[PDB]
Design a protein around this ligand. Structure first.
Ligand SMILES: *CCC(=O)N1CCC[C@@H](n2nc(-c3cn(CCc4ccccc4)nn3)c3c(N)ncnc32)C1
Length: 262
């Protein structure tokens, strides 16, 4: 419903004035950091203006529909409530720390395989959930779509309006090497040509990566979409099985990276 914030199982009757605007979070729509004055909780709030593009507002509302129905997925950023006014809709989301793209930028180098292993488990399980439970096929996982927090959580966001597995492959190569495989392309069509004309960009062999990690990326980067595997097969990959159970302190790694300067 609307007019309520649910944070940690406690349900709070609320209105937009109960929220203090602490500033915009990034350059791209409008997502604000806000403080719920009644408790001190801080949340991320997407603002949809009534005066915006009519067709584009319909697309936000269809995504919101998925987000609202995704409360049983631990790998998707959760919605805490909505506020509807005469001129706006405000969508309250759990506040995450930052995205993988920014972690890569602050690290100024490769992200370790153990972190990418936990990230792969989260993302694959998020994508499979969206397919199996909602018929949603997200095809552009990218480092800017993968959020992390100082509690070590990893969740997908901005996934609305198989093919999915290629973009996960490319994101993993970019984050593992510190280098976007298509950085030297000056147009989107040039990237398309490279994808079709060149061999897939696999992980290098001189960086200590496990055979499992290399195999997983090679599987994601299968060019012939008929040979791309099913989700129930990808979820059995030895790379996933290892990082489902291996204890990795993502939280401390996150805090260490964020404490670096630029
Ligand atoms: C690479 C990180 C980055 O630059 N950005 C841009 C600024 C905001 C950052 N950010 N986004 C969210 C977020 C987005 N959503 C989806 C909202 C939605 C869209 C359509 C329909 C319904 C809902 N949910 N969360 C952030 C969160 N939650 N925390 C921190 N930063 C966030 C990403």
């Amino acid at each position: 419903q609307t007019g309520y914030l649910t944070i940690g199982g406690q349900r709070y009757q609320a209105e937009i004035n109960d929220l203090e605007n602490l500033g915009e979070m990034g350059s791209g729509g409008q997502v604000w950091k806000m403080r719920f004055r009644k408790t001190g909780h801080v949340i991320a709030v997407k603002q949809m203006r009534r005066s915006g593009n009519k067709e584009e507002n319909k697309r936000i509302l269809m995504d919101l529909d998925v987000v609202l129905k995704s409360h049983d997925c631990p790998y998707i950023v959760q919605c805490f409530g909505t506020f509807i006014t005469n001129t706006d809709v405000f969508i309250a989301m759990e506040l995450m720390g930052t995205c993988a793209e920014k972690l890569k930028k602050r690290m100024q180098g490769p992200i370790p395989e153990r972190i990418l292993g936990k990230m792969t488990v989260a993302i694959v399980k998020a994508l499979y959930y969206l397919k199996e439970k909602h018929g949603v096929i997200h095809r552009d996982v990218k480092p800017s779509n993968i959020l992390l927090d100082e509690r070590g959580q990893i969740k997908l966001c901005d996934f609305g309006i198989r093919a999915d597995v290629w973009s996960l492959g490319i994101s993993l190569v970019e984050l593992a090497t510190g280098q976007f495989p298509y950085k030297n392309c000056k147009t989107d069509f040039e990237v398309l040509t490279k994808v079709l004309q060149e061999e897939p960009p696999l992980l290098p062999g001189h960086m200590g990566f496990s055979g499992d990690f290399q195999s997983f990326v090679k599987d994601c980067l299968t060019k012939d979409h008929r040979k791309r595997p099913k989700y129930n097969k990808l979820l059995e990959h030895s790379f996933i099985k290892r990082y489902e159970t291996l204890e990795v302190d993502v939280a401390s790694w996150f805090k260490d990276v964020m404490a670096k300067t630029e």
